[PDB]
Structures are given as C-alpha cells and as structure tokens.
Design a protein around this motif. Structure first.
Motif, PDB file in Angstrom:
ATOM      1  N   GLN A 102       0.851  -1.182   0.000  1.00  0.00           N
ATOM      2  CA  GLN A 102       0.000   0.000   0.000  1.00  0.00           C
ATOM      3  C   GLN A 102       0.888   1.233   0.000  1.00  0.00           C
ATOM      4  O   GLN A 102       1.658   1.447   0.943  1.00  0.00           O
ATOM      5  CB  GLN A 102      -0.932   0.008   1.213  1.00  0.00           C
ATOM      6  N   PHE A 103       0.780   2.040  -1.049  1.00  0.00           N
ATOM      7  CA  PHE A 103       1.554   3.265  -1.164  1.00  0.00           C
ATOM      8  C   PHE A 103       0.734   4.449  -0.670  1.00  0.00           C
ATOM      9  O   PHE A 103      -0.494   4.470  -0.781  1.00  0.00           O
ATOM     10  CB  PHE A 103       2.000   3.500  -2.609  1.00  0.00           C
ATOM     11  N   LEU A 104       1.430   5.432  -0.111  1.00  0.00           N
ATOM     12  CA  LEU A 104       0.787   6.622   0.436  1.00  0.00           C
ATOM     13  C   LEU A 104       0.227   7.445  -0.716  1.00  0.00           C
ATOM     14  O   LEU A 104       0.962   8.150  -1.410  1.00  0.00           O
ATOM     15  CB  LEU A 104       1.782   7.423   1.266  1.00  0.00           C
ATOM     16  N   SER A 105      -1.081   7.357  -0.922  1.00  0.00           N
ATOM     17  CA  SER A 105      -1.742   7.979  -2.058  1.00  0.00           C
ATOM     18  C   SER A 105      -2.489   9.239  -1.635  1.00  0.00           C
ATOM     19  O   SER A 105      -2.715   9.489  -0.449  1.00  0.00           O
ATOM     20  CB  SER A 105      -2.714   6.999  -2.717  1.00  0.00           C
TER      21      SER A 105
END
Lengths: 565, 75
Positions: free
Chosen positions: B25-28
C-alpha cells in the motif's frame, strides 16, 4: 499542585497554540491576564501568558481549530489552501568596500548628521555642558567636528557609512553629480526647500527600516519591549520620525551635487437528463474554477484537465477541458456565476452576474457534443487563500440571477425537489494509504511464488520518493516490546524498543530511480524476518515499521516524537 | 518464526508463505472526505468578560463509524 508527568523530547517545529477539545455538555472558561480574564493562581517564574503572546496592534479571537466547523446553512464560506502567514534580519551593508573617492562626502554627511543632532537638542533647549545628561538639557557632543574626539564622532561617521553602503546595496549609484546656541553654529544650507522624489522617499524609508532592524536585533537581548517587532510591524505614528532622521542623508547627497482544493456533491446525485442550473458565488477574484464533472473525477488532478470534467476559470477567462480555450470574461471580488447544463441537447453555458458568456466564435454555448456517460455532478476548485460559496438551489428567494436566465428555458435548480441538503464532499488533505492499482503509471508491483517475493518496477522520466507499506500490521503484546534492524552483517541501528501495546506496520520509503527493483521478502532465521532487499543507488531509502502516520514530504528526520514521563 | 505467522490465524507453520491479503500500500492522495450535515453548534459568549473567555456546548451529537482492524482505521 502540578502533575507528575510531561511530554519531554517532542518536535518543536511548528506554531504551538493552546487548544481545548470537548464533546457535549460543557461550559469552559479560558483564563488569561488583563481584560480577557483573571488568573486563579500565580504563574511560575518566567512563564508569560497568551494575552501577552498576541502580536502588537492585532486582535485576538477564537476559531475552532482548522476550518468552517460552524452549524450554518449553505452560506458557508468554503476555503481552499492558505499560505504560511508570509512571515513564519537587516540588509547586508558592511560587505562592500567603501570607495575613498567619496570618503570626503561621507565625512561631510557625518558632520551634517552631527550638527542636526545638535540642532534638534537645541530646539528642545539643550546647551553644551560637560556632564552627559538628558534632563539637564545639555550635551557635550555639540562642539565643532574638528574638536570632537574619536569617542564622539564615530557615531555620525558610521551612520554616513551605513547610509551610503545601503544605497550601493540597493543599487543606485553614488558618485559625482536663527536660534543662538552656546558656542556652535549649525547652519549648512537651506536643505528643506527642494522636493524629494518619491524614489528617494522610499529610499529613506528603507534606511529607517534597516536602522530599526539593527536596533531591534540589538534590543532582543533584553523585558519584552513592544518595539522588538520589525519596522513593518510597527505603529504608523513613530515611523515618520525615523524616516526624517534618514531623509537628510539623501538630502545632503542631492544638494551637494553627488495545492488547490476540490469540492463536489455526492456521486449518487448525478444527472442524465433535463436542464440543471446552480450558482457559484466568489467574494474574491483569485484562482477559482467551476463546472460539471463526471463521477470519476480525480481529487488531486486539475479540474478539467482530463475527460472527467468540463469547467471554467475566471482568473484567466478560459473554459477548461483537455486543454484551455479563451472563453468569456474575468470576474471581480464579490461576483456570482450561474452554470447551466442541458442533457437533452448536450449544452453547457455560464452566466457571469446574469450576463451570458461569449466564446471567440460568437456562440454563447461553451461545451457541446459530450457523452452522457454515467452523469454530471457540479464541482468547484479553489486555489490558495480563495474562499467561495455554492448554491444548488432549494432557495429561490436567495437565488439572484435565476429569473434573469434559466426560469424561462425550462432550466431547473440542482436541488429544488429535495427535503434535505447535499452531502458536499471535498478533497481531503491527509494522504492515507491505498493499494496499488493495476492501471497506475510509473509504479508497478508483481508477486512471485525457495522464498516468496513481491518485486517492483517502474517506467517514468520524473523521480520522487514513495512510502510503500504492507497491509497487515504486527501487533505487540503487553510484555514484548523490542525491534532490531540487522543489516547484511549484524544488528546495528537505533534502539527502537518501546511499545507496551501497539501495532506496527512494515514499510519502506524508496526513491524512484530509472530502474528500481528493491523489494520485500518475508524470510526466516529464528523469528519474524522481513528483508527489504535493495539494489544499486541505496543511500536515501529507509525500511522500518510504522503505526498510522499520514505525512507526505521528503525528509529522513524531523519526525514527530514525544517521551512521556 | 515468520512475519506472516504472526498476524494470521495459524502460528505453528514455519513455512514463509504470503496470503493474498499481503499487498503493498503506497501513500496515495486520491481520496474524498464527506462534510457532515450537522455540526456541534458551539456558541462563544462574544462578550469577553473580565473573568475569562467563555465557550459553551449543550446540544449532544453522535455518529457511528466502522473500524477496519487490519488497517486500524475508523471510517
């Protein structure tokens, strides 16, 4: 009686402020000094209060914490991003060599400054006495320039030096172009007859600014005088004296011949047929766009730059689509714009204060021959320090330019047949974590499977830093509380062993190179092991375990912290 | 013994496998927030009396929120 705890070792970056949080059923009273309140106990030595922390010549009010958390109707002033108050040192003059060609001019101006130092004191009624006093209306520094010693002339000398140095630093070139006292005769010439240009007026203003800056930098070592604020933050009453004190320098010089925020409605309120009209009021004239988007619009991309929105911007008078086209005219502070969309004809039109906008081809139509898709929802976008207001209808008594346009062509308000207000969704600021989508450019993640790995990949031209994080976090019991980072050799890292009852999520912050194959591998030696296998150019990538943290920036340190005692 | 063998049901399986839930999960930034239709309606005394600054809140207000545990977040 004080408490037995405090939050030492906390990050001091930021503008601290007192705050009170409450749910319901409460009556609270802040207590300060002066007209705001009265202290019940005595403060410890040194600790001042907020009624003294307030900046001079500025009011003190109480907002909630951030935004318009007010129980109000549609007349809520929606605000976009803001600036850091534009304010959250004097000019350098000493680093220029003083040309000896005008050292005589410097000394003449110093003599003039000294003789005016004599003049104004004598205007008050000061004679020449041997005792350095102020109430005895006497001054021993009123004697001839030549008999003035080094202990009394350096003041005016340095004054002239710094005046001409500030002149050269600003950029203008310097070159070639009665009341009877007690022994001294100050009367150079008639230097208060010719007009001074406004350029030189601002020059003397800047000289006074620099002088007050150096004086305040000297005075900050003392307590808390109201004049410790810079010159621009000073009362308008005493500026003229400091300006006159410096005006005579140039008088002699001339006489002697020398992150936008997006707002929209609920996706379920999309429309597919009919004529829909809504108002957008703007009390400012900055960066503000208004229009109709599809229920797939990006909350971070610019409004209209894709095939998911059709907007209009008055700051440049341009209709906004995949590209910008000059359309209509700009607005001013305190204007309104009514946007109308007919889905039976695929027609978009905008009226600025009842005046229908014209394109370059002489057609009031803005947008035409577009898909119905899944629907069109109203949308607005505000820039820095831009506030506005939206009106989806339901208030025909408040709608101004509905009778002027829309009432006769079968155009209907967006929320006329509604028994409750709209949800009014917005673009949030805190960037929470999301799973990597398959249709995402410049970031691709694979998964294979011996050992199991989840490799990365990228194809892009512009580089940044990411914040990759695993989904499921590891929770720590009441007893266990330790974390060791072991490199290719042994365990050599910061002592991160403090968690009575927490949940840490594994993560790695990797910079994007042209080829980025650094990945995570769940491995095993004796206990839970996650190996963030990097590759070439590994000097700014980090790998650790983190709890819920929402911050997007580029920094290795300056992270929030606090040790409770 | 394993990372996967700590936040899952089974623990006596020392084979380091990865379930489909384990995804990066990337910081979007693509996220929308909902502006509530009702606030707390806080009223300040607005008189600024010489005995303090008064703030008052009487009307109660509640709401429910789901708690995603594996994300440890309330929505």
């Amino acid at each position: 009686q004080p408490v037995q705890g405090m939050f030492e070792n906390f990050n001091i970056d930021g503008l601290f402020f007192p705050v009170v949080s409450f749910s319901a059923g409460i009556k609270v009273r802040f207590l300060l000094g002066g007209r705001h309140g009265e202290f019940k106990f005595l403060p410890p030595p040194g600790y001042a209060a907020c009624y003294e922390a307030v900046l001079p010549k500025e009011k003190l009010k109480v907002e909630h914490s951030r935004e318009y958390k007010q129980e109000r109707t549609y007349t809520r002033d929606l605000l976009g991003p803001t600036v850091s108050l534009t304010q959250a040192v004097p000019v350098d003059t000493s680093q220029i060599v003083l040309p000896p060609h005008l050292e005589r001019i410097r000394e003449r101006l110093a003599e003039n400054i000294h003789e005016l130092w004599v003049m104004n004191k004598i205007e008050l009624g000061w004679q020449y006495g041997p005792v350095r006093d102020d109430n005895k209306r006497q001054h021993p520094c009123l004697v001839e320039f030549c008999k003035l010693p080094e202990q009394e002339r350096n003041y005016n000398l340095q004054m002239s030096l710094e005046t001409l140095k500030t002149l050269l630093a600003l950029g203008c070139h310097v070159g070639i172009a009665y009341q009877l006292t007690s022994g001294y005769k100050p009367a150079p010439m008639d230097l208060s007859f010719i007009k001074l240009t406004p350029s030189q007026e601002a020059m003397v203003d800047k000289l006074a600014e620099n002088a007050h800056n150096v004086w305040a930098r000297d005075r900050i070592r003392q307590r808390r005088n109201p004049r410790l604020v810079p010159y621009t933050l000073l009362d308008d009453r005493t500026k003229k004296s400091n300006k006159d004190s410096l005006r005579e320098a140039v008088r002699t010089l001339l006489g002697y011949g020398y992150r936008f925020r997006i707002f929209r409605a609920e996706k379920t309120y999309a429309v597919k047929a009919g004529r829909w009209y809504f108002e957008f009021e703007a009390v400012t004239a900055g960066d503000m766009r208004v229009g109709w988007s599809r229920p797939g619009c990006q909350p971070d991309l610019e409004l209209g730059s894709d095939d998911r929105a059709f907007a209009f911007d008055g700051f440049k008078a341009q209709r906004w689509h995949q590209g910008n086209e000059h359309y209509g005219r700009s607005w001013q502070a305190g204007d309104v714009v009514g946007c109308m969309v007919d889905m039976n004809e695929h027609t978009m039109m905008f009226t600025l204060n009842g005046e229908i906008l014209l394109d370059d081809s002489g057609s009031e139509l803005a947008f035409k021959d577009f898909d119905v898709g899944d629907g069109f929802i109203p949308v607005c976008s505000l820039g820095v320090a831009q506030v506005g207001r939206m009106n989806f209808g339901k208030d025909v008594s408040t709608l101004k330019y509905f009778t002027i346009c829309g009432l006769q062509e079968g155009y209907e308000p967006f929320a006329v047949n509604t028994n409750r207000d709209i949800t009014m969704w917005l673009s949030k600021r805190l960037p929470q974590f999301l799973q990597v989508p398959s249709n995402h450019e410049h970031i691709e993640v694979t998964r294979i499977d011996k050992v199991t790995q989840k490799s990365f990949g990228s194809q892009n031209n512009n580089t940044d830093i990411m914040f990759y994080r695993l989904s499921m976090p590891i929770e720590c019991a009441x007893x266990x509380x330790x974390x060791x980072x072991x490199x290719x050799x042994x365990x050599x890292x910061x002592x991160x062993x403090x968690x009575x009852x927490x949940x840490x999520x594994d993560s790695d912050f990797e910079v994007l190179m042209k080829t980025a194959h650094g990945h995570l591998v769940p491995d095993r030696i004796d206990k839970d092991k996650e190996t963030p296998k990097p590759e070439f150019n590994n000097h700014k990538d980090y790998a650790q375990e983190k709890p819920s943290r929402l911050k997007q920036x580029x920094x290795x340190x300056x992270x929030x912290x606090x040790x409770x005692x | 013994p394993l990372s996967a063998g700590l936040f899952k049901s089974e623990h006596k399986n020392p084979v380091p496998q990865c379930p489909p839930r384990l995804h990066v999960q990337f910081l979007s930034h693509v996220l929308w927030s909902r502006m509530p239709n009702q606030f707390l309606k806080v009223d300040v005394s607005r008189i600024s009396e010489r005995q303090g600054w008064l703030v008052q809140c009487l009307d109660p207000l509640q709401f429910m929120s789901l708690h995603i545990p594996e994300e440890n977040r309330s929505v």
